[PDB]
Point group: D2
Chain length 410, copies 4
C-alpha cells in the first residue's frame, strides 16, 4: 500500500497516464492555488519535468510520484475531501451570489476627510475567502491595495498580547465595550481606554509594541509580523495616506495628550512619537486577498493556513476574536454581534476583516461607508452570509433549521 | 448483517451470553442514565424478562435482541463512542476535580434580601452536567431545589422569541449590554430597556408571553414549556419566595411605573399584574439536575437531549445564547465574556446557567454571592473549566495549546 | 407739631375741608388697596363717619385725625413717598406696556395631559404686582383661580426649612441643580434628590412637613400657612385637578418607589400617602393677585407685606430664593438665571411666581407653555421686565446704564 | 454758604485752626487712603503748605479752603458718613476678627504640581477690602504677590464681553454650570464649552480677545485693562510660572486639540498660540491689595472705585458676576452659592476673588487648598463673613434677623 500511488489512481481515472493539465485543474478545484507556499516542491518538480520530456505531457505512476511525494499528506487531504469545506466548488458559487447581492447596494459615502480615500471610486467591491486549510476564492477588485486603517487595530493587539502577555497589556487597556453613548469618552472607570478596538486603546496598544527601540524599527517589526500573517502576500504602505492622517488627527492628538496627563502609557514613553507610529500603522496597505489570510490566521489558532507557520500565540488570537466580537464595528458592534456573531473589524477605507472561527477568514472592501462608519456592502454581505450559512457564533452545528452548512457533504 | 447482532458481539466479549449487569454497566459508562426516556422501552423489556426468567440472569443473542430492538440507534452510538464526549468517564473525573477545586473558596455573602434566600446554607455547592447527547453526571448538592431567580430571564426570553419572533420582541427590548456604569438606567436611547437580561428588560419581555390570558394560565404555559426543556425533571414553584419577592420588590415597582409612563408595554397591559407574574417566574424551582437539561436544550439547538423533543426554535435559542454571552452576568458580563466565552446566566439563589454550544449544558449552584451578584464557587468553576478545556467560544478546535479537548479520543 | 395734622395739611392743600374721595384717591395713587388689612381701623372709622353726617361728605383737622390716627405711620410713609417705589403711578404704566407686549406673544401649547389644564383658554394672561410695602397693581385676568402645580414646590420647602431648619431638611434633599442632561435622574451621588424644585425632591420635601399626623391635618397645616403667606387672599383647591393628577402620576409613583427602595424618606413614612399629599398640594388654587402676595412675602424677609406678620424665618426665605434662582424654570433654569437674574418658580398650569428681592413679588399667568414647560407670555414678560428695570440680581444699583430704576425719584 | 466752609466747621470742632494731622486722622478713619488717586490734588497742596510755612502747622478756614477745593465733593461724602459703609472703623475690627478666626484653620495641601506654587508657605494668609467708594482695609500678608491663575478667567471673560457683547461671546461658550459630575467633559450638548469658568471655556474665550494681533500685543491689551481695574496698583507677571505652566499643561493641550477638532474657536485661530497666551494670562501676579480693587470694579457697575474711571460695560460686569456666582468655585460652586451666595472665583495659588454687589470687593489669599481646589482659609472666611453680615445674595435688607448690616448706622 502506498500513499502516492493510491492518489495516482484516484486521479488516474483508470487511464494509464495523467495529463499535466488534468492534474492542475484537479488541484485548483479543491480550492487550492498552484502558488501555495506549502506546495512549491511539488510545483518545482512540475516546472522541472515540463522541459525534460516535452513529448508528453503525461505523468507515469513513477513520474507523478516524482513530483507529489514531497507534498503528499496535504495533496491527499485535498483530494479525499478532508478540507474544512469539502465541496469547495459549490461554496464559492454562493460566495459569488452573495457578492453580487451586495454589489447592488449603492448607498453610502466615501470617507472625505483625507484626499487619499476621497479619490477611491465608490464602485469598488472585492471579497476574498481563505479557509483554515488554504482553500481560496476571490470575486471583484480583490487585488487593489488599500489601507487597513482600524482593521490594523486587532492585528497590532494580537502582536502585543503575543509578545507581552494578556496581563501586562490589560493593565494599560480595558477589555469590554463602553456603551452606545460612552462612544465619546476616552477612559473607563479605571482610567484605561475601554478596549484595544477604540482609538484611545489602540493608541495605547501601539505604545506597548517593541519598546526601547525607535519608531522606524518598530514599524519594520510590525511589518515583519504582518508578513508572517498573510503568508507573504501583499503588505504595503501608502506614505500619502500617512501624511494626511498626520496633518489631520487633532482628535488623536487630543486623545494622546489626555492619555499622557492621565498617566496611561508605560514609563518612558514619548507620546507625540507613537501618534506618528499609530498614524503609520493605519496607512499600511493590504489587498482583499492578502488580508483574508491575516483573517484566516486568526481563524486557525494563530497558524498561517498557506504556510503552516505559528504566527500568533493561541492566547493572542482568542483575546482578539473576543474583542472583535463586541467592540469591532464602532457603534454597530452591538447589533452586529447579535445578527452576525462573527468577530469582525472595520476601517474607514472601506475594510471589513472577518473571521469565521475554525472555517475561514475573509476581507471585504467597498469604500462607501454607512452613517456609523462601516462598508455599506461589507455589512450587507456579512448579514447575507450568516443568513445562508450556520456560521453564526451561536448557531447549532447539529440542528440548524434551513441554513446550509458548508463543512458537510450531503 | 443486523445492528442488534453486531452490537451484541461488541459487548459479548466473544462469549455466548451477556449478563444484564454487564450490559447495564456498559450502558451507564457511556454516561447514559438507565432512567433515560429514550431508553424506557429497553429497560421495560429487561425488567420484564428478568421477571419471566428468574432462570438467569443472562441474555443470549436473540434474548438481548428482543430488549434493544426498540432503542437500537441510540444504544449503538452509545457503544460505538459516537457521542459528543466519547470518553465520558474520564471527563466526569475532570468535573469532580474542578468541583472540588471550586469547593475550597468559602468567600461571599448569601442573599439575605428575603427570609427565604437567607435560609440557604453557604456550604451547598453542586454541578450538574447534561451533554447535548444526554450523558449525565453530577457531584455535590445537585438535588436541592432552589429558585431560578434571574436564571429564568433567558428561559422566558427564548419562549417569547419562540412564539413571537425576533422583530416583535425587539420592538420592546434592546439587544446590547448597557455600559459598565449605565447599570442604574432602565431605558436606552430609544426608550426600550437595554436587553432581556436586566430587570427592566425581563419585565417588559414577560408582558409579551401569552397575552390576553389571566396570570394563572400564563404561569402554566411557562411551566409546561420549562418542563419540556428539562425532560420532565423537577420544575417546581416556591410560594415562600414569591410572597417575599412581592412585599420587598420596591425597585421592580419603581421600574414597572417608569415603563408604563414611557409606553414600553404592549397596549392593554396590566402593569401591576405583570409584576406579579414577574415575581412568580423568579420563584420557580429547579434542582441542579433538572436545570442542566434546560441549559443542555439551548446547547442543542432547542431539542431536549434526554427526550429528543423540539422545545424551542433555532432562532430563539440563538438569540438567547447571544444575549447571555454579553449581558448575562450583571456587571461581570464583560470580564466573563472575555475570560470565559460561554453563554451564562446568574441568579441570586446562587445559580449560574451554563451552555457550551454543541457540547453540553450545566448548572452550578452555591448560594453565597460575591460583591457583583454571582455565586463565588460558580465563577471559580467556570474559569477553571475554560482554562482546562477548549470550550471558550474563541478557542480553536485544532490548535489549543495545553488544553484537553473532551470531544476527541487520543 | 403733630403727625396726624401735618399729613392732613399735606393732602388738604391749604383749603379748609378735605372731601372723602379726594383722600381715597390720594391713598389709592400711592398703590395701597383700600382693602389693605393694615388700614382696617382707618377704613372702619371712615365707614362709621360716612353715615352720621351724610351732609358732607367732608372732614376737618379733628375728624380726619379721628380716622387716620390708628394707621398714621403707614398712611404717612405712603404719602411722604417713602414706599420702595416712590412713583408707583408711572411704574404701573410700564407694567401695562410689558403686559401688552406679552399678550402679542401668541405661541405655545396649553398642557393637555389632564382635562383640567386643557380646558383653560390660551388667551388668559395676567400679571399681578405687590411690593414689600403692599402697593398693588394688576392687569389682565388676575382673579381667575388656577392651579399652583410646581409653583408650590418652593412654598413647601419654605415651610419645611421654617419648621425644622436647613440642616435637617438637607439630609433628604440636595441644594444644587443637576445638569441639563441629568434631568431624568432622580438622585445625585449622595442618593438624595438633587434639590426641592425637582419632582424627585419636592416629593421628598413633602414627606418632611408635619410628620406623624395624618394627611388631613397635614394639608390643613399647609393650607393655614399658605393663608398667612397671602394675607388671607384667595387660596383654594381643585379636587378635579387632584383626581386626574393622581390617576396619571405613573412617573410620580415611579419616583416614589425609587426613593423608597433607596431609603430617601424619614423613618416611618407611608410612601403612597406622601404621593396623595403631594398631588393635593399641586392642586392648591390661587389667582394672579393672591399668589403675587405669596411672592411678596418672599421678597420681604418672611413678613407678609400687607398684614405685617412674620410667616417664614429669614433662614427659610433665603434658602428658597437661592434655589429658585438656579432650579425653578426646569431646563430653562440656566438661561433664566443668566438673563433675568431673578428667582422664579414655574408650574405646568401656566403660572410663574417671581420674586424681585427687596422690592416686589409677582405672579404671571397664561396657560400656553413652551418646550421646556414655562408660560410663553410669562417668560417673555420676565425678560422684558429686566430689560427695562435694573432688577437683575447682579445689576449695579448706582451705575446701571440706560436701564430704569423704579426705586429712585429723579 | 460754601462746601469747604461748612466741612471746615464739621472738623473744626469750634476751634479756630485744625491741626493737619488731626485732619488726616479724620480722613483715614473714613477708610479713605491718603494715597487715593481722587485725592491727589489735596495731598499735594497739603505738603506744599507744610513746606511754605513750617510756621505752624495749623490750618485756618482760609488755608483749609486752599487745600480741599480740588477734591471737596469726595471729601464731604467721606466726612458726612455718606459712604456705602458709614462706620468703617467698626467694620474693620470685624474683618480682623474673622481673619483671626480663619487663621486658626490650618488644613489643606499647598498646590505643588509646579515648583512656583510649592514655593509658598502655608501660613501666608491675607485679606484686603475695597468698597465701591474706595474705602480700604487689609490684614495679614496682603502685599505678597501671587498668580491669579483661574482668578483671571472672569476678568478676561469680562474683557471679551465688554469688547464683543454677550451675543457674540456666547456663540463660543455656553453660560451654565455643567453638572456636579460632568466635570470631566469639555463641551455641553451644543459642542460649546459649558461656561467661561472651566479650563476649556476660559481657553476659547482667550481666543476671542483682540483677534488678529500677535501675543505680545494681546497681552499688552489685556494688562492695559487690568491696571485700570486696580487703579494702577500692582499687576505683574511671573515668567517663572508661565514656563512651568506650559511644560506641564498636558490636559490644557488635550483640551486645545479637542476644541480645534469640534471647531469651537473662531476661524483662523492658531490653537497652540492661543494656548501660550492662556498660560500667560494665568501667570499674571497681584497682591491681595491690588486684586481687591479688581473685585471692587465689579461691585461697582464697571467703574473703578478709586479712580472714578469706567473700565467695564455694565453688561460685561453683570454677566461675569452671574457666572461667578454659579460657576466660580470649581465643584464647590453649588454649595458656595447656597451657603455664601456671593460671586466668587478661586484659583490654585490660593486666591478667592470675591464681590458683594453695591458694597465692596475682596481678595482672600492662603496657599493651602482643600480637596476641591479652594483656599481652606478663604472658604472659611466667606462662610463666617456671611453668617455675620446681610451680604448673602438673597438676604433681606429689611428683616435680616441677628445679622449685622454695615450699610446702616444706629
Ligand atoms: C435616554 C435615557 O437613558 N433615559 C433614561 N434611561 N433610564 C433612566 N432611569 C431613570 C429612572 C432611574 N434612574 C436613575 N438611575 N440612577 C440615578 N441616580 C444616580 C446618582 O445615578 S437616577 C433615572 S432615564
Ligand atoms: C455632550 C458632550 O459634549 N460630551 C462630551 N464632552 N467632552 C468630551 N470629550 C471627552 C474628552 C475628555 N473627556 C473625558 N473625561 N473623563 C473621562 N474618563 C471618565 C472615567 O470619565 S474621558 C470627554 S465628550
Amino acid at each position: 500500500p502506498s500513499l502516492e500511488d493510491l492518489l495516482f489512481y484516484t486521479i488516474a481515472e483508470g487511464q494509464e497516464k495523467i495529463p499535466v493539465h488534468k492534474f492542475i485543474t484537479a488541484l485548483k478545484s479543491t480550492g487550492l492555488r498552484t502558488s501555495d507556499p506549502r506546495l512549491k516542491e511539488c510545483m518545482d518538480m512540475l516546472r522541472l519535468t515540463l522541459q525534460t520530456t516535452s513529448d508528453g505531457v503525461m505523468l507515469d505512476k513513477d513520474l507523478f510520484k516524482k513530483c507529489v511525494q514531497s507534498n503528499i499528506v496535504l495533496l491527499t487531504q485535498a483530494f479525499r475531501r478532508k478540507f474544512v469545506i469539502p465541496d469547495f466548488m459549490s461554496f464559492t458559487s454562493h460566495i459569488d451570489e452573495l457578492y453580487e447581492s451586495a454589489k447592488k447596494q449603492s448607498g453610502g459615502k466615501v470617507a472625505d476627510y483625507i484626499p487619499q480615500l476621497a479619490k477611491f471610486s465608490p464602485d469598488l467591491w472585492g471579497v476574498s475567502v481563505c479557509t483554515a486549510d488554504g482553500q481560496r476564492h476571490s470575486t471583484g477588485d480583490t487585488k487593489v491595495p488599500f489601507c487597513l486603517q482600524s482593521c490594523v487595530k486587532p492585528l497590532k493587539y494580537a502582536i502585543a498580547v503575543n509578545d507581552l502577555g494578556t496581563e501586562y497589556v490589560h493593565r494599560y487597556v480595558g477589555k469590554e465595550p463602553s456603551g452606545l453613548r460612552f462612544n465619546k469618552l476616552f477612559l473607563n472607570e479605571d482610567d484605561k481606554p475601554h478596549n484595544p478596538m477604540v482609538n484611545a486603546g489602540a493608541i495605547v496598544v501601539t505604545s506597548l509594541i517593541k519598546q526601547g527601540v525607535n519608531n522606524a524599527e518598530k514599524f519594520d517589526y510590525v511589518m515583519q509580523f504582518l508578513n508572517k500573517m498573510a503568508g507573504n502576500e501583499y503588505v504595503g504602505f501608502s506614505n500619502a495616506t500617512f501624511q494626511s492622517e498626520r496633518e489631520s488627527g487633532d482628535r488623536n492628538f487630543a486623545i494622546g495628550y489626555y492619555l499622557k496627563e492621565k498617566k496611561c502609557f508605560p514609563e518612558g514613553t514619548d507620546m507625540v512619537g507613537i501618534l506618528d507610529f499609530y498614524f503609520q500603522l493605519c496607512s499600511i496597505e493590504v489587498t482583499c486577498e492578502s488580508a483574508s489570510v491575516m483573517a484566516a490566521t486568526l481563524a486557525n489558532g494563530g497558524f498561517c493556513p498557506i504556510t503552516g507557520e505559528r504566527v500568533l500565540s493561541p492566547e493572542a488570537v482568542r483575546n482578539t476574536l473576543s474583542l472583535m466580537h463586541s467592540c469591532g464595528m464602532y457603534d454597530f458592534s452591538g447589533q452586529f454581534a447579535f445578527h452576525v456573531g462573527l468577530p469582525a473589524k472595520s476601517g474607514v477605507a472601506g475594510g471589513i476583516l472577518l473571521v469565521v472561527p475554525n472555517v475561514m477568514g475573509m476581507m471585504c472592501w467597498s469604500p462607501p461607508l454607512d452613517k456609523m462608519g462601516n462598508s455599506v456592502k461589507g455589512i450587507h454581505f456579512c448579514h447575507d452570509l450568516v443568513s445562508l450559512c450556520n456560521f453564526h457564533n451561536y448557531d447549532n452545528l447539529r440542528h440548524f433549521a434551513k441554513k446550509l452548512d458548508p463543512r458537510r457533504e450531503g
